[PDB]
Design a protein around this ligand. Structure first.
Ligand SMILES: O=C(O)C1=C[C@@H](O)[C@@H](O)[C@H](O)C1
Length: 427
């Protein structure tokens, strides 16, 4: 068991050029692979989740090249649905943005492919997506537990009237949206009831439009898709910096700045997590917006009580920032935290108590009352990059913190600790 101990950070100040967005990177790679023409992606993220997507594309026969730092990628588009037979197994780690999108995309035409991943991935739900794909004609088999990967995909998705549940994950709808335009028949995707974390659907539609495809969005209740379409290379495409990765640095300034500026995202970004800056502002920090930057300057930090379903990933950063705020913070409507890299409600509550907080783990919310002073703890990270990054903020106090398995940050941000250190000042 590897570990990293962070010594107390007296002040943070500086500029961070953000790594590329994981959400955008994996969507852009799949669309580039399906598209006609060569796509040159710049500022692509190099992390575990993107490497699993690249490996899957290689296994499916897609040709591409990567620059030395793996942030520039020239993809030779396949000009249509990807194919493989022989129950070829694609190992997708714990990458939801590879597993859900490929589960749908590979249902086009004929195929015989198996999608699997790490143990936790076999415990992350995919049943609602499989139900929708089957309504459209896909043949899918659960090889282990019903409603979870691994899946054996044998193709057959032709389109038609498909219902999909959007109450557990927005990724199921994202996967259907990217796939449907290439189906031979027109598709009408009806959302059964509620739709969680809607901003990710906006990211998906933005990327599809960049690749030449638009659909009819009827108030996020129904999506009308014309079949027989083709994705087209946009030529050169710049991947936005990651707004979720940015949260740690902006929060660091709200707690211990100084001013921290992150570049690569700005007011025009398509990522919902830029709204994390609004939460810091509501807590008392000062935010500055640019076309290609967002900065946060220390003001004060007061507890908040808010629905965080629109920014589930960045919301975890508020849970550790709450350790430094005045009053009790409550984050609500985050049941979805339970079905991600780990059950984040359980994990966050457990680790927060270790540093002294009084925490109520609600079924779908978390209430955090900070201690007068934090104490040292060895933080368990649950193979979850965000647990490591969120708890790194504990060091913006008088106590060091030890983070177990620090390399788990590589899922989305291999250089996280170096970057935090870049803005860490002793004076
Ligand atoms: O579609 C996406 O890119 C994502 C959607 C949400 O489930 C997030 O929680 C997940 O980390 C990424």
């Amino acid at each position: 068991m590897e570990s990293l101990t962070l010594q107390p950070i007296a002040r943070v100040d500086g500029t961070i050029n953000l790594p590329g967005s994981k959400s955008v990177s994996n969507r852009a790679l799949l669309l580039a692979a399906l598209a006609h023409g060569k796509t040159v992606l710049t500022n692509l993220l190099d992390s575990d989740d993107v490497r699993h997507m690249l490996n899957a594309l290689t296994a499916l026969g897609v040709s591409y090249t990567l620059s030395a730092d793996r942030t520039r990628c020239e993809i030779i588009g396949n000009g249509g649905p990807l194919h493989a037979e022989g129950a070829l197994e694609l190992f997708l780690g714990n990458a939801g943005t590879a597993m859900r999108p490929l589960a749908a995309a590979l249902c086009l035409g004929s195929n015989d492919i198996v999608l699997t991943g790490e143990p936790r991935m076999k415990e992350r739900p995919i049943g609602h997506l499989v139900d929708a794909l089957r309504l459209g004609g896909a043949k899918i088999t659960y090889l282990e537990q019903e409603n979870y990967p691994p899946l054996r995909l044998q193709g057959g998705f032709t389109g038609g009237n498909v219902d999909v549940d959007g109450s557990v994950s927005s990724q199921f709808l994202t996967a259907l949206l990217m796939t449907a335009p290439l189906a031979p028949e027109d598709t009408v995707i009806r959302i059964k009831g509620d739709l969680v974390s809607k901003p990710y659907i906006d990211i998906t539609l933005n990327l599809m439009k960049t690749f030449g495809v638009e659909i009819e969005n009827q108030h996020y209740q129904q999506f009308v898709v014309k079949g027989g379409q083709s994705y087209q290379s946009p030529g050169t495409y710049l991947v936005e910096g990651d707004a979720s990765s940015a949260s740690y640095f902006l929060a660091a300034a709200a707690i211990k700045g100084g001013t921290v500026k992150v570049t690569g995202i700005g007011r025009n970004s398509m990522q919902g997590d830029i709204r994390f800056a609004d939460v810091l502002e509501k807590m008392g920090a000062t935010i500055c917006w640019g076309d290609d930057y967002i900065s946060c300057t220390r003001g004060e930090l007061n507890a908040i009580d808010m629905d965080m379903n629109h920014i589930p990933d960045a919301a975890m950063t508020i849970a550790t920032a709450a350790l430094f705020a005045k009053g009790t913070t409550t984050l609500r409507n985050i049941y979805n935290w339970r079905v991600k890299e780990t059950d984040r409600l359980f994990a966050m509550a457990t680790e927060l108590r270790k540093v002294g907080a009084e925490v109520e783990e609600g079924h779908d919310y978390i209430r955090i009352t900070p201690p007068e002073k934090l104490n040292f703890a060895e933080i368990a990270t649950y193979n979850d990059h965000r647990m490591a990054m969120c708890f790194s903020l504990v060091a913006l106090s008088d106590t060091p913190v030890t983070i177990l398995d620090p390399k788990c940050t590589a899922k989305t941000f291999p250089d996280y600790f170096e970057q935090l250190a870049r803005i860490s000042q002793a004076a």
